Amino acid sequence: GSGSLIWFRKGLRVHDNPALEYASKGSEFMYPVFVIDPHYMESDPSAFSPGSSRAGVNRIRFLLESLKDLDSSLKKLGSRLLVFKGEPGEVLVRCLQEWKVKRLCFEYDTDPYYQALDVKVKDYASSTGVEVFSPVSHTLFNPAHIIEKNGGKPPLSYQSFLKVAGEPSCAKSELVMSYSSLPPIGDIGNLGISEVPSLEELGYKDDEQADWTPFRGGESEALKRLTKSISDKAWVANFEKPKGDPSAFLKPATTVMSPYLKFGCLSSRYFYQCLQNIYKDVKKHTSPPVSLLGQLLWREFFYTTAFGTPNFDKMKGNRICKQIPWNEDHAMLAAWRDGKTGYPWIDAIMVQLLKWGWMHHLARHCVACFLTRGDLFIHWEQGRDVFERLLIDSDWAINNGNWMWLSCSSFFYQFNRIYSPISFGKKYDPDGKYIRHFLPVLKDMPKQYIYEPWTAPLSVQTKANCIVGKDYPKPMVLHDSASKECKRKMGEAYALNKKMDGKVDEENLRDLRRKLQKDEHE
Numbered sequence: 001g002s003g004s005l006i007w008f009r010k011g012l013r014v015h016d017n018p019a020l021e022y023a024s025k026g027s028e029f030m031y032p033v034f035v036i037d038p039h040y041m042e043s044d045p046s047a048f049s050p051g052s053s054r055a056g057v058n059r060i061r062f063l064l065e066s067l068k069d070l071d072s073s074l075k076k077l078g079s080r081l082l083v084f085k086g087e088p089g090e091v092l093v094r095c096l097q098e099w100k101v102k103r104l105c106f107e108y109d110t111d112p113y114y115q116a117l118d119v120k121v122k123d124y125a126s127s128t129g130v131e132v133f134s135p136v137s138h139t140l141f142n143p144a145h146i147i148e149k150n151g152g153k154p155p156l157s158y159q160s161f162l163k164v165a166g167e168p169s170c171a172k173s174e175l176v177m178s179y180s181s182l183p184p185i186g187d188i189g190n191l192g193i194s195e196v197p198s199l200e201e202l203g204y205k206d207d208e209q210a211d212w213t214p215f216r217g218g219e220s221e222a223l224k225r226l227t228k229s230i231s232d233k234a235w236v237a238n239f240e241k242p243k244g245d246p247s248a249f250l251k252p253a254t255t256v257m258s259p260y261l262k263f264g265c266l267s268s269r270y271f272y273q274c275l276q277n278i279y280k281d282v283k284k285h286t287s288p289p290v291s292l293l294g295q296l297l298w299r300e301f302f303y304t305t306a307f308g309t310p311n312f313d314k315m316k317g318n319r320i321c322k323q324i325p326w327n328e329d330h331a332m333l334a335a336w337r338d339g340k341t342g343y344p345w346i347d348a349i350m351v352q353l354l355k356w357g358w359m360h361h362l363a364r365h366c367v368a369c370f371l372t373r374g375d376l377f378i379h380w381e382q383g384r385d386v387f388e389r390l391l392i393d394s395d396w397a398i399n400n401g402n403w404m405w406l407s408c409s410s411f412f413y414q415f416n417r418i419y420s421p422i423s424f425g426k427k428y429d430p431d432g433k434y435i436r437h438f439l440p441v442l443k444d445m446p447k448q449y450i451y452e453p454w455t456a457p458l459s460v461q462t463k464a465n466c467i468v469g470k471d472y473p474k475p476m477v478l479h480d481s482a483s484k485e486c487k488r489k490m491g492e493a494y495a496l497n498k499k500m501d502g503k504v505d506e507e508n509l510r511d512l513r514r515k516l517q518k519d520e521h522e
């Protein structure tokens with residue numbers, strides 16, 4: 001008889017799943033599918049840290065966990081999760097041509113990877129008589145609608161986006177959070193049926209599995225943590241993003257729902273709905289941009305902008321990105337990536353990236369600034385790539401948008417507002433608790449130098465059992481001069497961008513790069 005297939009990619013959850021719902025109705029049997037793409041999941045010995053070439057082992061373990069939770073939640077309703085390994089496009093059509101499937105459902109998505117897959121699968125299904133339901137539930141708004149309504153392009157600013165965006169449909173909507181039951185799986189036919197694969201099966205040695213980010217994945221954890229994240233009504237009511245403490249690691253200054261919203265473990269519509277409820281239950285609460293709900297709106301802003309901008313994930317070809325002659329220097333990038341820059345604050349943060357796969361927004365700010373238009377002047381696409389595989393909440397739209405923001409390549413252009421690798425952390429942690437924790441090599445350094453070990457008298461060092469240049473590196477660069485040179489180049493780069501009416505050529509750029517080379521080398 002007529003069967004259905006619920007294809008899972010990002011909505012790794014049972015609650016608020018418009019796609020899963022439809023797949024359960026009018027079907028005597030249902031096929032829940034998820035494909036492990038070797039290219040993204042399997043071990044890559046060439047990578048700079050355990051994982052594939054696109055994902056650190058941390059985000060991978062998170063996904064695998066989300067998958068187990070999901071299957072489990074399905075095995076509860078009498079269903080199950082069928083996991084195949086291979087190129088999704090191939091796997092999917094081979095599933096269609098193998099099963100009596102008349103209806104194919106999967107949550108919509110705007111990432112390039114998925115836009116590409118969905119054209120193929122859609123065309124195959126359409127040409128083979130399979131119905132296709134691809135509802136928008138990963139975001140509160142439909143990028144295409146916003147862009148269409150706004151004329152022909154995406155609103156140029158948060159403020160402008162909210163005006164146009166209006167309010168999400170899920171507002172007065174009633175979401176489906178549970179199901180009494182779910183259609184039985186149905187003939188598995190002849191396909192390599194598989195259970196969620198272990199890190200080992202993905203090719204990872206045990207030493208590559210020693211560390212553990214402190215955040216389990218899955219819808220279960222998701223919902224549980226949301227409950228904890230917003231239990232304090234006053235806190236959520238008085239929420240102001242800029243006022244959070246970036247050094248607070250024992251108790252993160254924000255929700256950390258980031259990874260669950262990225263893999264769809266948590267519906268953002270439900271979250272948005274909860275916030276709404278507790279907002280009306282008080283009377284006085286913060287509003288965007290700084291509000292907690294205002295944060296779900298930043299996600300919306302970048303997604304819409306990302307979906308409407310070709311070459312969004314790169315400078316060249318990007319309508320909205322300022323053309324800047326960034327340097328390239330695997331040695332400098334490496335020093336920053338592994339957290340060996342010399343500035344304890346920056347290094348401590350980069351280590352939290354590697355160990356937690358998450359850092360407070362402001363921390364992400366500092367290291368992104370230091371790496372680009374703040375001190376090193378390395379291409380933002382480079383910090384972007386490092387972040388993309390290390391963050392357990394790595395999100396295409398969000399990550400690219402933010403790196404362009406922190407590099408003053410787009411959205412924000414007050415490049416003379418530079419974070420200080422030395423003094424910023426003090427504003428919150430003068431004792432340097434955060435640093436000591438993630439950089440135990442400086443465990444004993446006296447607070448008078450914790451943010452600048454290179455200024456600690458040689459005697460203090462040896463006693464603190466930390467010698468700059470041996471145990472802990474010395475400043476890879478001197479902030480003052482560095483940031484002053486960045487502010488300089490940044491100036492002439494903007495000058496060129498303005499002179500060429502936002503259309504700098506491959507030529508001009510090259511000539512600027514040369515020009516700056518002279519004025520800053522001889």
Ligand SMILES: Cc1cc2nc3c(=O)[nH]c(=O)nc-3n(C[C@H](O)[C@H](O)[C@H](O)COP(=O)(O)OP(=O)(O)OC[C@H]3O[C@@H](n4cnc5c(N)ncnc54)[C@H](O)[C@@H]3O)c2cc1C
Pocket residue numbers: 241254255256257258259261262292295296297298299300302359360361362364365368387391393394395396398399400402403406
């Ligand atoms: C250079 C740089 C790279 C970044 N890369 C990513 C990334 O790959 N994935 C990612 O999810 N966030 C990224 N961010 C944005 C932000 O830091 C995170 O969303 C936030 O730290 C997540 O913590 P939280 O869940 O406690 O956020 P909360 O403050 O508790 O907000 C709740 C939710 O709102 C969303 N949100 C919060 N801030 C932003 C923001 N500035 N832009 C868009 N959405 C936001 C997130 O989905 C988050 O889970 C990046 C920021 C910078 C400066």
